[PDB]
Amino acid sequence: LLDQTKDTRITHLLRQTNAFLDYYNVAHRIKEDIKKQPSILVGGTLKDYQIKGLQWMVSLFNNHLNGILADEMGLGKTIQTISLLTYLYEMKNIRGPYLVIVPLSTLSNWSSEFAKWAPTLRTISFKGSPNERKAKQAKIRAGEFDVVLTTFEYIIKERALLSKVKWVHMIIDEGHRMKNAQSKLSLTLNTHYHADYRLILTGTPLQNNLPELWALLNFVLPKIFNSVKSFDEWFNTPFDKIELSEEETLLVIRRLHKVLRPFLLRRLKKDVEKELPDKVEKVVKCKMSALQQIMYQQMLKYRRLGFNNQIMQLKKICNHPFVFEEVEDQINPTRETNDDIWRVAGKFELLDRILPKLKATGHRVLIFFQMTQIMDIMEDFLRYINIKYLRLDGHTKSDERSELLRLFNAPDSEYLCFILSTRAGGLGLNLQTADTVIIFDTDWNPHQDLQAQDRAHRIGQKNEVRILRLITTNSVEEVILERAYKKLDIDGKVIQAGKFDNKSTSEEQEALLRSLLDAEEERRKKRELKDSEINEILARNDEEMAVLTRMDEDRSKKEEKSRLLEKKREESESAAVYNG
Amino acid sequence: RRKTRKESYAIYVYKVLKQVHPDTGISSKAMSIMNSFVNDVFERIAGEASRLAHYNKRSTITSREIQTAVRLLLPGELAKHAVSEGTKAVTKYTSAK
Amino acid sequence: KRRKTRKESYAIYVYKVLKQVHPDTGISSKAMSIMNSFVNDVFERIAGEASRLAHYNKRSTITSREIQTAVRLLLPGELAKHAVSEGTKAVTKYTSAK
Amino acid sequence: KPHRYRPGTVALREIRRYQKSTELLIRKLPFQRLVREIAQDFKTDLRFQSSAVMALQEASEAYLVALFEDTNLAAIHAKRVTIMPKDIQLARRIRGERA
Amino acid sequence: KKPHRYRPGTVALREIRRYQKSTELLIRKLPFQRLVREIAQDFKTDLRFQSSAVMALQEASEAYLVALFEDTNLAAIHAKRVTIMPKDIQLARRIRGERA
Amino acid sequence: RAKAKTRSSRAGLQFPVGRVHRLLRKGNYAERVGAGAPVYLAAVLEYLTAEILELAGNAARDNKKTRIIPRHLQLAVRNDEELNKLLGRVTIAQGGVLPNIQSVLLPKKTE
Amino acid sequence: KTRAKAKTRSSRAGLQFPVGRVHRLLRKGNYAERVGAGAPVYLAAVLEYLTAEILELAGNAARDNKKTRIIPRHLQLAVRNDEELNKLLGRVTIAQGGVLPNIQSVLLP
Amino acid sequence: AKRHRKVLRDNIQGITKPAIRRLARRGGVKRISGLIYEETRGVLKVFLENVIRDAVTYTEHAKRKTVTAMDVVYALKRQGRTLYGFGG
Amino acid sequence: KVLRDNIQGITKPAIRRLARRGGVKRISGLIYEETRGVLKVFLENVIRDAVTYTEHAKRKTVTAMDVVYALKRQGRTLYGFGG
DNA sequence: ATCTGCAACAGTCCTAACATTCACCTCTTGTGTGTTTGTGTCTGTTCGCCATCCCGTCTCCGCTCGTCACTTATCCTTCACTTTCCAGAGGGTCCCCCCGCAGACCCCGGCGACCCTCAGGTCGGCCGACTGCGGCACAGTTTTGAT
DNA sequence: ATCAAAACTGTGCCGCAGTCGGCCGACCTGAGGGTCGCCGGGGTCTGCGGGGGGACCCTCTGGAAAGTGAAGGATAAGTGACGAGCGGAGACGGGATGGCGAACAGACACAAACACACAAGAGGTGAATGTTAGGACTGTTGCAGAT
Ligand SMILES: Nc1ncnc2c1ncn2[C@@H]1O[C@H](COP(=O)(O)OP(=O)(O)O)[C@@H](O)[C@H]1O
C-alpha cells in the first residue's frame, strides 16, 4: 500500500520544476479549465473527447507536470497536440519555443496539419541536404522560431543546434522507439538539458516488456527514477495462478491502476467514433509435412542434439523449408517450379485450398510475413499460379510506397491479394479497402496486432474483417504464439485502465476489471484441419456459402500426386545424414 | 679414461630404415643429418607445446597440447597423418595393458 | 561489486619513465598499450635467449652473465653497448650499495 | 577552359595524403564479411570479437602495404612505372612466401 | 684447319649441368680458412677453430651465396636480360630484408 | 622487521624488479633464477623504454602536439636505424609508413 | 617376488622411438612444469612418422640413382622434391647437400 | 528464379577497386595496372586463410567458440608478422 | 700473403662456379666485388655470434656447435654438423 | 612566360572525449627473517687436437688475345590507364527481440611428481671381416656446328 | 647432311668405410607403492555477439568518355662478356714435433628455494576536472596548367 507514500514523495518533489525552472493532490491541486476551443484553430472543430483531452492537458500544464497522452489509433492525436500548442500560444502567452519530434513517415502530415489548424504559427521542417539546412541553421540561431519539427536522427545529428537553444516545452511522438532506456536517443535526451516539460504520444502502451518503466517511470517524470527504480520488480512480480495473480496481487494491479490514473489519458475508438464495424479474430492450425515431420528431429539430433541460435532457424522450417536452397536441389535440382515441391510446406496446402476460393468470393487480402525469403518464395509461387498481387518490403525507398496505394486501391483493381511484411511500412500504409487478413508467422510483440490489424481496422472500411492466423502441429511457433499472446495479455490491464483513464465512472476497475478477469480466467480454460470447417469460417454470408458449395459441386464430378509429400521416401532420410 | 656418453637417435633411425627398406644402408653423415633433424623437430614441437601451456594458464603438457602443436607446426597432409599416428599410438598404449 | 580481475601491465612504469625523460608530456592510451606490448616482447626475447644459454652450457641457473650474453646477442650495436653499460652499473650499484 | 590536371599529379597528391594520414583503408563491414566467410570455410559455428576483426584488418593492411612497396621496387627495376602481376609474383617469390 | 671455338653460352650450359649434378665445396679450403680467421681476428685475438667449425662456415656461406644467385637470376630475367648485374644483387637483398 | 625499501628503489631503477623476478620465476625459463637477473634485466628494459619514449617525444614535439600517439612511435622506431633493425618484424597498430617516395616517380624539371 | 620388469613404453604403443628418452627430455628440458602421460608416446609417434616418411622418400631416390646407400645428396633430393617437406624444412640447409637440377626455361636456346 | 544466392555478388569483391588503389597509393605506387586488383585479391585471400587457420587452431584447442584478439595476435606471432597494440 | 689477399682469396672462378650452381648463364664484372662484400658482411655477423657464445662459455675454441647455434639464431638452420 | 586556379597550409572559438589526479578501498604481494641443500667454484691431472713447420706435386688461377652476341639507346606506334562527371547504393549508424556463451568464483576426486630398489638397453672401443665405392685406366653412344 | 669433342655408360680392382657379432660396462628406464596439487565440472551473475529484419543519412564507388603518356617492338651501333691457350704458384694430401686448453674428478661454501606475516605499493573507479586534440570558419599562397 505504497500509494500514500509515493503521494507524499510527489508532495515533496513536485516543486522541482516549479522552483528550478492523495494522487489527486498533485494533479488536481489547481482547478482551472477552459472547455471552449481556442480561436485560431481553423479548418473544422474538435470532437467532445478531444476537448476533454485538451482540458486535461491544460490541467497538466497548470499542475506543471509531465503528462502522457496514450489514446487509441484514429482519435486525433496531432490535432490535440496543436490545440495544446495554440492554447499555450494564445492564453498562456509564453508563445514559444515548441520542439516537436515526429517520425519521417509522418512529418509531411504534421507540417500539413500545421497549415489547417494553426496558420499563424511559425514552423520549421528538417530534411536531408545540409546545403539546404545551413540557411535554416543560421535562421534558428537567430531566434525567429516557435514550432520546430525534426525527426529522430537529426536530434543527435543537430546536437549543437539543440544545445545552443533553451526551449520551453517539447512534445515528442511515437513512444515505441522511446521504449528503451539505454537507447542512444534516450541518452542524448537525458544529456539534452531538458527545459521544462515533455510528452510522449503513443497509440500503444506496454508491448512485449515489463510495465511502463522506460518513459512513464523513469524518463517523463524524473522523481520516479529515485522512487520506483527498485519497486519495478516488486510491482511487476504479479504477472502461481489463483493465490498470487488473482487473490492477493489484484490489489497490486489496483495500485498500478491508481498510480497510472493521473499521469495518463486513454480513450477508445468504439466509445466515441465507432466508425469501424467489427473484428473477427479467428485462428486455424496447419500440420507438419515431409521434411517438417518426425524426420526433422533427426536434423536437430545430428546438428545440435549446425546453425547458431536455432530458434531463428526453427522458424524457417515452419514458415517454409529449403530457404537454405541447398536441399531444394536435393528435391528439385532443375530449379523448375512445379506441384508438390513448393507445396511441401504445410501452410501452402492451406494456401492453395483457401486463396482460390476467396478468389471465388472476391475479398481483397492482406498477406503478411516475416523473413522476406518467404516473401520471395511466395512471389515465385504466385507467379507459378499467375494471380494478381503486389509486394512491399524495406527496400521500396518510400516513393513507390507512397505511389503503390493507387495501384492497389484502383476502384476496379484486379489485384486482390497483397503481400506484406509485418514490420514494413512504419504505420504508413494508411489503407482501408482490403477486407481479409491472413498471417503466416507471429511476431514477438502485440504490435503485429496493433499495427497489422489496424491496417484495416482504421477509418474507411465497412466490411467484416476476417482475420486468420497460421500455426502447425507441435512446433516452436506454438510456444511463440502462446508465450507472446497469453503472457503478453498484460496490455489487457492497460486497455481496462483506459476506461477509467477517461471521464472515470469509478466502478470500472472493480466491475469491468472483473469482466476483464473473465478473460483472465478463461486463459487456461481454453487449454484442453477440415475443408468444410475452414471453408465456413472464412466465409461471411449465404451467397458466399453458395459459391463455396458451387465450387464443391464443380469438383464433385471430378476427383478434387497426393495432398502432402512425406518423408520421396529415401531422399528424406538421405538429406541431412551426410551433412553433419 | 672412459669417455662421457654421447646419446642420440642413431639406432632408432637405423631401425626405421630397416623397416621401410630392408636392403638399403645409411651413411654416417646422413645418420648425423637425421639425428639433427629429429632434435630440431623435437625442439619445435615441445616449444609450441610449452607456448600453449603458458597461454592457456595451465601447467601440464598433455596429448591435447602435443596434438595442437602438431596441427600448427606440420602442414597439410603430413599434419593429418601425424595426428592419425598419434591417436593410434595413444589408444593402443592406454588400451593394451 | 564483481572486482574486475587484475591484469598487471607496465603502464605506470612507462608513464613514470616518460615523466623522467620529458617533464610535461602525456601519452595516449593506445600508445601506452603499444609500449606495454613492447616491454613484454623484449622481456620474452631476452628471457628466452637466457633459457637457451642455460641449456647450452649444461647449467641450470639464469644469472647476470646469462642476461648479459642475451643482451649482446639480441641488441644491435650502440643499443647493446649502452644496455650492457646500464646493466653493469645497476647491478654493481644494487650489490655494493646494499 | 576546364582545369584538368596532366595525368600523374592526382596520383602524387594521393600518395602524399595517404602516407600522411593513418586510418584503415578498407571498409570495415566488407572486410568483416570476408573474414567471417574464410572462417566459415574451417569451422562452421564460430564467433569473433570486434578487436579480433580489427586485429586482422591491421595485419592485412600493413602486409599489403609492405607488399606494394616491394612491388614498386621490382617495377622500377624493370624500367617501368606501372606495376604488374609479374612484379607481384616476383616480390612474393624473392621474399619467399610462395616458393 | 680451324680449331673448334664453341659458340659462347654452351660452355655455360654444360657448367650449369655439371655443378647441379655434383655436390662438393667450391671455395677452396685454405683461402676460406684464412678469411674466417681474419674476420674472427676482428673480435678476439687468441681464438682457435675446429675443422668442423670452419667447414660449417663454408657449408653455410656457400649455401647462402647459391640461394642469392638463384634470386639474382630471377631478378635479371625479370628485367628482360640474361647478364646479372650489381643492381640485381642489391635488389634481392632489398626485397629479402637484409639491406633496407 | 624494519622499514623495507623495494628492490627497485635499492637498485636505483623504475621498473619493478620484484615483478620481473616473479615473471622469470613462473615462466619456466630455468630452474634457478639468480639474484642479479631481475635487476640486470629491469635495467635493460628501462634503457629501451627510455630510448623509445625519447625519440617519440621528439617527433611528438615536431608535429606540434603534446601527446604521444602510435604514428609518433612509428616515426621514431623507423627513423632510428638500430630500432629499425631490432623491431624490423613488428607491425605497430594505427602506424602508417614513413613518408617516402622514389625519385623515379617524381616528375622531371623539363616541361 | 621381484615383479617381472619388462615391457618398455615403446613396446606397448608399437613405436620404435624411445619413449623413455623422449619423456626424460620433455621433463628436464624445462618446457612446462609437469609433463603428462600420453605426451611422449604421442610425440615419439609423430617423430617416427616423420623419419619414416623421409627415409621412404630417400630410399625411393637411391633406387633412382642406382645406389644401395642413402647419402646427403639423396636426403636433399627427397626433401626438396616433396612439396610439403620442402615447405616444412624451407629454412634448413643440409650440409654436403647440393641443389636441385633446375634450369630456367628462358635461358636455353 | 530471383530467389537464389547465386544471383548475388560474392564476398571477395567487397574489397573494392579504389580500396586496393588506396593501399597502393600508401605503398608509394604511382601508376597501377588493371590486373593488380585481381592478383591482390588472390594474395589477400591466401594471407587471411593462413592467419585465420592458425587462430582457429588456437581457439579449438582452448575449448571455446570465440576467436579473440589474443588468438589472432598469437597466430600472427608465430606467422612472423608480429603485431603490437592489441594485447600483451 | 700478408693479409692483403684474404677476401681476394675468394677467387673469380670460384665466384663463377657458385654462380653456375645458381643457374646464372652470364656474369658482369662487378658481381665479383659485390659478392665479396656480401660474403664478408654475412661472415662478420655469424662469427660475431659464435665468438659471443665462445666468450660466454669461458673458453678459447670456436667449435661446430657454437657455429650451429649462431646460425640457428640467425634464421639459417644447419643440419649435419652436430645434434 | 603573367595570369588564373585551386588546394594544401595556417589562425581561431568550440565542444567534447579523454587523460589526470586524488582518494581510498581493498587487497594482493613483494619484502624481511630463518633453515636447507645443492649447484657452482677452484684446483688439479692428462691427452686429443690444433697450430706450425716442411714438402713434393700438379692442376688450376691469371693473364692475354680474339670475336660476337648481348646490353642499350633511338623512334614509332598503339592502347590502356587516368581524370572528370553524374547517379545510385551500400556502408554507417541506430533499433528490434531473444538467446546463448565466455568469464569469473567453489568443493572435489585424478593423477603425476616422488623416492627407492632392479635389470637390461644402449654405448663404446677394439677386433673381424665384409662389401660399396671410387680412381686412374680403357672402349662405344649422342649432341654441336659448319659445307 | 657428315666429321668432332666430349660426357654418359660399361669394365676392372682396390681403399675404405659401414656393419655386425661381440664382449662387456655402466647407468638409467621400469614398476609397485605413497601423497598431494590440478583440473574438470556443475552452478549463478553479467555483458556482448549472433540472426532474421526494419528506417534513415550521406560519401564512396561505379560506368563511361576524351585524352595522352607509358609499354613495347624493330633496328642498329657499341662493347664488354666468354672461350682457349699457356706458363707459374699456391693449394693439397702426407707426415711429423710440440704444447695447450678442454674435459673429467672432488670439497666445499655461499646462494637460492621454501615457508611465513604484512603493509605498503599497485589496480580499479568515479569524478570532477580540466584540457588538449578534431571540427569546422576565414584567410593566405605554393604549385600546376590553359593561353
Ligand atoms: N476534430 C477533428 N476534426 C476533423 N478531423 C479530425 C479531427 N480529429 C482528427 N481528425 C482526423 O484525424 C487524422 C489524424 O489523426 P491523428 O492525430 O493521427 O490520430 P491517430 O494517431 O489516433 O490516428 C487527420 O487526418 C484528421 O483529418
PDB file of C-alpha atoms in Angstrom, chain A residues 287-450:
ATOM      1  CA  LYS A 287       0.148 -29.548 -39.663  1.00  0.00           C
ATOM      2  CA  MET A 288       3.644 -30.743 -40.497  1.00  0.00           C
ATOM      3  CA  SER A 289       4.786 -32.084 -43.855  1.00  0.00           C
ATOM      4  CA  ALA A 290       7.630 -34.174 -45.326  1.00  0.00           C
ATOM      5  CA  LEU A 291      10.804 -32.588 -44.010  1.00  0.00           C
ATOM      6  CA  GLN A 292       8.778 -30.967 -41.209  1.00  0.00           C
ATOM      7  CA  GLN A 293       7.763 -34.414 -39.854  1.00  0.00           C
ATOM      8  CA  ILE A 294       9.362 -36.763 -37.302  1.00  0.00           C
ATOM      9  CA  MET A 295      12.359 -36.744 -39.700  1.00  0.00           C
ATOM     10  CA  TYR A 296      13.095 -33.157 -38.609  1.00  0.00           C
ATOM     11  CA  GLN A 297      14.077 -34.099 -35.051  1.00  0.00           C
ATOM     12  CA  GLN A 298      16.892 -36.220 -36.532  1.00  0.00           C
ATOM     13  CA  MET A 299      18.221 -32.968 -38.032  1.00  0.00           C
ATOM     14  CA  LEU A 300      18.389 -31.447 -34.562  1.00  0.00           C
ATOM     15  CA  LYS A 301      19.724 -34.776 -33.249  1.00  0.00           C
ATOM     16  CA  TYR A 302      22.746 -34.552 -35.553  1.00  0.00           C
ATOM     17  CA  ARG A 303      23.248 -30.773 -35.707  1.00  0.00           C
ATOM     18  CA  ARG A 304      22.648 -29.897 -32.035  1.00  0.00           C
ATOM     19  CA  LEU A 305      21.084 -32.760 -30.051  1.00  0.00           C
ATOM     20  CA  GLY A 306      24.929 -26.806 -37.156  1.00  0.00           C
ATOM     21  CA  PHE A 307      23.472 -23.306 -37.326  1.00  0.00           C
ATOM     22  CA  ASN A 308      23.713 -20.829 -34.470  1.00  0.00           C
ATOM     23  CA  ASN A 309      20.731 -19.793 -32.234  1.00  0.00           C
ATOM     24  CA  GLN A 310      18.396 -22.455 -33.693  1.00  0.00           C
ATOM     25  CA  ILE A 311      15.186 -20.688 -32.556  1.00  0.00           C
ATOM     26  CA  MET A 312      15.736 -18.364 -35.501  1.00  0.00           C
ATOM     27  CA  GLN A 313      16.424 -21.458 -37.623  1.00  0.00           C
ATOM     28  CA  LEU A 314      13.472 -23.489 -36.302  1.00  0.00           C
ATOM     29  CA  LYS A 315      11.094 -20.812 -37.564  1.00  0.00           C
ATOM     30  CA  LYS A 316      12.390 -21.287 -41.111  1.00  0.00           C
ATOM     31  CA  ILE A 317      11.071 -24.831 -41.375  1.00  0.00           C
ATOM     32  CA  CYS A 318       7.638 -23.881 -40.082  1.00  0.00           C
ATOM     33  CA  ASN A 319       7.366 -20.957 -42.445  1.00  0.00           C
ATOM     34  CA  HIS A 320       8.756 -22.971 -45.403  1.00  0.00           C
ATOM     35  CA  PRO A 321      11.660 -25.419 -45.871  1.00  0.00           C
ATOM     36  CA  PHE A 322      14.536 -25.093 -48.338  1.00  0.00           C
ATOM     37  CA  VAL A 323      15.012 -21.429 -47.664  1.00  0.00           C
ATOM     38  CA  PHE A 324      18.517 -22.844 -47.345  1.00  0.00           C
ATOM     39  CA  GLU A 325      18.046 -23.877 -51.036  1.00  0.00           C
ATOM     40  CA  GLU A 326      20.801 -26.454 -50.546  1.00  0.00           C
ATOM     41  CA  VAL A 327      18.169 -29.149 -50.003  1.00  0.00           C
ATOM     42  CA  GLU A 328      15.901 -27.640 -52.670  1.00  0.00           C
ATOM     43  CA  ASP A 329      18.464 -29.035 -55.102  1.00  0.00           C
ATOM     44  CA  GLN A 330      18.153 -32.322 -53.216  1.00  0.00           C
ATOM     45  CA  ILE A 331      14.461 -32.308 -54.119  1.00  0.00           C
ATOM     46  CA  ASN A 332      14.366 -30.150 -57.290  1.00  0.00           C
ATOM     47  CA  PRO A 333      17.881 -29.742 -58.758  1.00  0.00           C
ATOM     48  CA  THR A 334      16.462 -28.388 -62.027  1.00  0.00           C
ATOM     49  CA  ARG A 335      15.052 -25.374 -60.029  1.00  0.00           C
ATOM     50  CA  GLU A 336      11.899 -25.506 -62.171  1.00  0.00           C
ATOM     51  CA  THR A 337       8.749 -24.734 -60.194  1.00  0.00           C
ATOM     52  CA  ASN A 338       6.061 -27.428 -60.097  1.00  0.00           C
ATOM     53  CA  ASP A 339       3.340 -29.003 -57.972  1.00  0.00           C
ATOM     54  CA  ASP A 340       4.191 -30.586 -54.572  1.00  0.00           C
ATOM     55  CA  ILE A 341       7.664 -29.083 -54.425  1.00  0.00           C
ATOM     56  CA  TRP A 342       6.645 -25.585 -53.434  1.00  0.00           C
ATOM     57  CA  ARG A 343       3.711 -27.354 -51.740  1.00  0.00           C
ATOM     58  CA  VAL A 344       5.895 -29.313 -49.300  1.00  0.00           C
ATOM     59  CA  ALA A 345       5.196 -26.808 -46.514  1.00  0.00           C
ATOM     60  CA  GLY A 346       2.024 -27.455 -44.552  1.00  0.00           C
ATOM     61  CA  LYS A 347       0.720 -23.895 -44.714  1.00  0.00           C
ATOM     62  CA  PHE A 348       0.913 -23.963 -48.505  1.00  0.00           C
ATOM     63  CA  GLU A 349      -1.647 -26.729 -48.951  1.00  0.00           C
ATOM     64  CA  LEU A 350      -3.912 -24.490 -46.895  1.00  0.00           C
ATOM     65  CA  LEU A 351      -2.983 -21.627 -49.230  1.00  0.00           C
ATOM     66  CA  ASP A 352      -3.961 -23.326 -52.454  1.00  0.00           C
ATOM     67  CA  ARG A 353      -7.121 -24.502 -50.762  1.00  0.00           C
ATOM     68  CA  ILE A 354      -8.191 -21.140 -49.338  1.00  0.00           C
ATOM     69  CA  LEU A 355      -6.773 -18.497 -51.712  1.00  0.00           C
ATOM     70  CA  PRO A 356      -8.537 -19.719 -54.930  1.00  0.00           C
ATOM     71  CA  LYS A 357     -11.839 -19.812 -53.051  1.00  0.00           C
ATOM     72  CA  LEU A 358     -11.550 -16.326 -51.585  1.00  0.00           C
ATOM     73  CA  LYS A 359     -10.691 -15.507 -55.182  1.00  0.00           C
ATOM     74  CA  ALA A 360     -14.024 -17.207 -55.912  1.00  0.00           C
ATOM     75  CA  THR A 361     -15.709 -14.828 -53.439  1.00  0.00           C
ATOM     76  CA  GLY A 362     -13.666 -11.718 -54.181  1.00  0.00           C
ATOM     77  CA  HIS A 363     -12.122 -10.380 -50.988  1.00  0.00           C
ATOM     78  CA  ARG A 364      -9.066  -8.127 -51.022  1.00  0.00           C
ATOM     79  CA  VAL A 365      -6.470  -9.916 -48.947  1.00  0.00           C
ATOM     80  CA  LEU A 366      -3.508  -8.673 -46.929  1.00  0.00           C
ATOM     81  CA  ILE A 367      -0.945 -11.486 -46.680  1.00  0.00           C
ATOM     82  CA  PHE A 368       1.721 -10.877 -44.051  1.00  0.00           C
ATOM     83  CA  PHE A 369       5.158 -12.365 -43.482  1.00  0.00           C
ATOM     84  CA  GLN A 370       8.317 -12.188 -41.563  1.00  0.00           C
ATOM     85  CA  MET A 371      11.577 -13.411 -43.137  1.00  0.00           C
ATOM     86  CA  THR A 372      11.456 -11.918 -46.673  1.00  0.00           C
ATOM     87  CA  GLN A 373      12.942 -15.050 -48.279  1.00  0.00           C
ATOM     88  CA  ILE A 374       9.483 -16.484 -47.615  1.00  0.00           C
ATOM     89  CA  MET A 375       8.157 -13.434 -49.476  1.00  0.00           C
ATOM     90  CA  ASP A 376      10.473 -14.280 -52.379  1.00  0.00           C
ATOM     91  CA  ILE A 377       9.326 -17.915 -52.462  1.00  0.00           C
ATOM     92  CA  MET A 378       5.702 -16.771 -52.245  1.00  0.00           C
ATOM     93  CA  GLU A 379       6.457 -14.439 -55.168  1.00  0.00           C
ATOM     94  CA  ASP A 380       7.829 -17.382 -57.162  1.00  0.00           C
ATOM     95  CA  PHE A 381       4.715 -19.457 -56.473  1.00  0.00           C
ATOM     96  CA  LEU A 382       2.314 -16.621 -57.038  1.00  0.00           C
ATOM     97  CA  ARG A 383       3.796 -16.200 -60.496  1.00  0.00           C
ATOM     98  CA  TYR A 384       3.653 -20.006 -60.905  1.00  0.00           C
ATOM     99  CA  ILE A 385      -0.124 -19.785 -60.411  1.00  0.00           C
ATOM    100  CA  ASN A 386      -0.411 -16.301 -62.077  1.00  0.00           C
ATOM    101  CA  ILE A 387      -2.931 -14.465 -59.921  1.00  0.00           C
ATOM    102  CA  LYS A 388      -2.520 -10.778 -59.241  1.00  0.00           C
ATOM    103  CA  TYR A 389      -0.601  -9.381 -56.269  1.00  0.00           C
ATOM    104  CA  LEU A 390       1.788  -6.653 -55.172  1.00  0.00           C
ATOM    105  CA  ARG A 391       4.809  -6.575 -52.875  1.00  0.00           C
ATOM    106  CA  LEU A 392       6.121  -4.177 -50.250  1.00  0.00           C
ATOM    107  CA  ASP A 393       9.295  -4.519 -48.212  1.00  0.00           C
ATOM    108  CA  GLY A 394      12.017  -2.443 -46.602  1.00  0.00           C
ATOM    109  CA  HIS A 395      13.721  -1.750 -49.955  1.00  0.00           C
ATOM    110  CA  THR A 396      10.992   0.237 -51.722  1.00  0.00           C
ATOM    111  CA  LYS A 397      12.660   3.639 -50.884  1.00  0.00           C
ATOM    112  CA  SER A 398       9.271   5.188 -49.866  1.00  0.00           C
ATOM    113  CA  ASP A 399       8.487   6.653 -53.290  1.00  0.00           C
ATOM    114  CA  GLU A 400       6.886   3.526 -54.718  1.00  0.00           C
ATOM    115  CA  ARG A 401       5.439   3.048 -51.215  1.00  0.00           C
ATOM    116  CA  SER A 402       3.523   6.318 -51.476  1.00  0.00           C
ATOM    117  CA  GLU A 403       2.731   5.538 -55.126  1.00  0.00           C
ATOM    118  CA  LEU A 404       1.563   1.925 -54.711  1.00  0.00           C
ATOM    119  CA  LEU A 405      -1.588   2.875 -52.782  1.00  0.00           C
ATOM    120  CA  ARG A 406      -3.202   3.885 -56.068  1.00  0.00           C
ATOM    121  CA  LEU A 407      -2.065   0.708 -57.840  1.00  0.00           C
ATOM    122  CA  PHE A 408      -3.654  -1.394 -55.121  1.00  0.00           C
ATOM    123  CA  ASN A 409      -6.653   0.881 -54.477  1.00  0.00           C
ATOM    124  CA  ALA A 410      -7.964   1.270 -58.005  1.00  0.00           C
ATOM    125  CA  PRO A 411     -11.797   1.038 -57.943  1.00  0.00           C
ATOM    126  CA  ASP A 412     -11.623  -1.967 -60.286  1.00  0.00           C
ATOM    127  CA  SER A 413      -8.230  -3.234 -59.106  1.00  0.00           C
ATOM    128  CA  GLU A 414      -7.927  -6.891 -60.075  1.00  0.00           C
ATOM    129  CA  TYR A 415      -5.075  -7.152 -57.613  1.00  0.00           C
ATOM    130  CA  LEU A 416      -6.905  -8.915 -54.786  1.00  0.00           C
ATOM    131  CA  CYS A 417      -4.241 -10.492 -52.600  1.00  0.00           C
ATOM    132  CA  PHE A 418      -1.352  -8.353 -51.401  1.00  0.00           C
ATOM    133  CA  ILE A 419       1.958  -9.480 -49.910  1.00  0.00           C
ATOM    134  CA  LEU A 420       3.321  -7.551 -46.943  1.00  0.00           C
ATOM    135  CA  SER A 421       5.927  -7.719 -44.270  1.00  0.00           C
ATOM    136  CA  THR A 422       4.635  -7.201 -40.746  1.00  0.00           C
ATOM    137  CA  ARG A 423       7.445  -4.835 -39.773  1.00  0.00           C
ATOM    138  CA  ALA A 424       7.266  -2.870 -43.015  1.00  0.00           C
ATOM    139  CA  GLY A 425       5.601   0.455 -43.707  1.00  0.00           C
ATOM    140  CA  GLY A 426       6.049   2.035 -40.283  1.00  0.00           C
ATOM    141  CA  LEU A 427       2.353   2.992 -39.880  1.00  0.00           C
ATOM    142  CA  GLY A 428       2.481   4.491 -43.362  1.00  0.00           C
ATOM    143  CA  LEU A 429       0.326   2.047 -45.285  1.00  0.00           C
ATOM    144  CA  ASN A 430      -2.820   4.069 -44.427  1.00  0.00           C
ATOM    145  CA  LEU A 431      -5.037   1.547 -46.222  1.00  0.00           C
ATOM    146  CA  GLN A 432      -8.741   0.845 -45.742  1.00  0.00           C
ATOM    147  CA  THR A 433     -10.082  -1.028 -48.773  1.00  0.00           C
ATOM    148  CA  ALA A 434      -8.946  -4.596 -48.093  1.00  0.00           C
ATOM    149  CA  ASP A 435     -11.188  -6.923 -46.106  1.00  0.00           C
ATOM    150  CA  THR A 436      -9.354 -10.173 -45.169  1.00  0.00           C
ATOM    151  CA  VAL A 437      -6.010 -10.696 -43.407  1.00  0.00           C
ATOM    152  CA  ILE A 438      -4.149 -14.000 -43.277  1.00  0.00           C
ATOM    153  CA  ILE A 439      -0.910 -14.284 -41.316  1.00  0.00           C
ATOM    154  CA  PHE A 440       1.841 -16.886 -41.638  1.00  0.00           C
ATOM    155  CA  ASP A 441       4.014 -16.342 -38.583  1.00  0.00           C
ATOM    156  CA  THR A 442       3.515 -14.277 -35.463  1.00  0.00           C
ATOM    157  CA  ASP A 443       5.810 -11.592 -34.097  1.00  0.00           C
ATOM    158  CA  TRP A 444       7.215 -11.447 -30.604  1.00  0.00           C
ATOM    159  CA  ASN A 445       5.006  -8.424 -29.943  1.00  0.00           C
ATOM    160  CA  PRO A 446       1.389  -7.420 -29.999  1.00  0.00           C
ATOM    161  CA  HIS A 447       2.485  -4.590 -32.238  1.00  0.00           C
ATOM    162  CA  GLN A 448       1.628  -7.043 -35.003  1.00  0.00           C
ATOM    163  CA  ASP A 449      -1.874  -6.854 -33.507  1.00  0.00           C
ATOM    164  CA  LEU A 450      -1.956  -3.102 -33.009  1.00  0.00           C
TER     165      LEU A 450
END
